[PDB]
């Protein structure tokens, strides 16, 4: 039962909304930390040199590319994580970033269905 070991994989502002945390959908700081050898969590450090406000352990969450849900109007890319009884959505400024996030989050959780990048050049709405 050692203390553990910190670690950073990817940091940057992102749009996410959950049920217990980030109830609101707004661009907030997001940092992927490593809790255990095979366990990670999303720590949102909004303060300046202080403890994190919101935190979501990615212990199980299944992140994967998903269509743009009706409502969330923050970022372009859309990606939500599926949990036994919890569901959280995430969005970035560009599609390129999303991938980098899915690739990491994927391993952090260790889901069964590995995420894969689509081939949607860029259709037009009407």
Swiss-Prot record:
Tissues where this protein is expressed: Specifically expressed in neural and endocrine secretory tissues. Expressed in brain and pancreas and at low level in heart. Also expressed in fetal heart, cerebellum, cerebral cortex, medulla, occipital pole, frontal and temporal lobes, and putamen, as well as weak expression in spinal cord.
Compartment(s) where it occurs, according to its Swiss-Prot or TrEMBL record: Synapse; Cytoplasmic vesicle, Secretory vesicle, Neuronal dense core vesicle membrane
Domain PH: 8-110
Organism superkingdom: Eukaryota
Signal peptide: none
Domain notes: The PH domain is essential for regulated exocytosis and binds phospholipids and plasma membrane. It however does not mediate binding to DCVs.
Subunit structure: Homodimer. Interacts with RASL10B. Interacts with the dopamine receptor DRD2.
Biological function: Calcium-binding protein involved in exocytosis of vesicles filled with neurotransmitters and neuropeptides. Probably acts upstream of fusion in the biogenesis or maintenance of mature secretory vesicles. Regulates catecholamine loading of DCVs. May specifically mediate the Ca(2+)-dependent exocytosis of large dense-core vesicles (DCVs) and other dense-core vesicles by acting as a PtdIns(4,5)P2-binding protein that acts at prefusion step following ATP-dependent priming and participates in DCVs-membrane fusion.
This protein's name: Calcium-dependent secretion activator 1
Shown chain mapped onto the complete sequence: 522 to 634 of 1353
């Amino acid at each position: 039962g050692s203390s553990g070991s910190s670690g950073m994989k990817h940091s940057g502002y992102l749009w996410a909304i959950g049920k217990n945390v980030w109830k609101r959908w707004k661009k907030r700081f997001f940092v992927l930390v490593q809790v255990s050898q095979y366990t990670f969590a999303m720590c949102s450090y909004r303060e300046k040199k202080a403890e994190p406000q919101e935190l979501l352990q990615l212990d199980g969450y299944t992140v994967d590319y998903t269509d743009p849900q009706p409502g969330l109007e923050g970022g372009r890319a859309f990606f939500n994580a599926v949990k036994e009884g919890d569901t959280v959505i995430f969005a970035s400024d560009d599609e390129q970033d999303r991938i980098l996030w899915v690739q990491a989050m994927y391993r952090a959780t260790g889901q069964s269905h590995k995420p894969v990048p689509p081939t949607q050049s860029g259709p037009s709405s009407g």
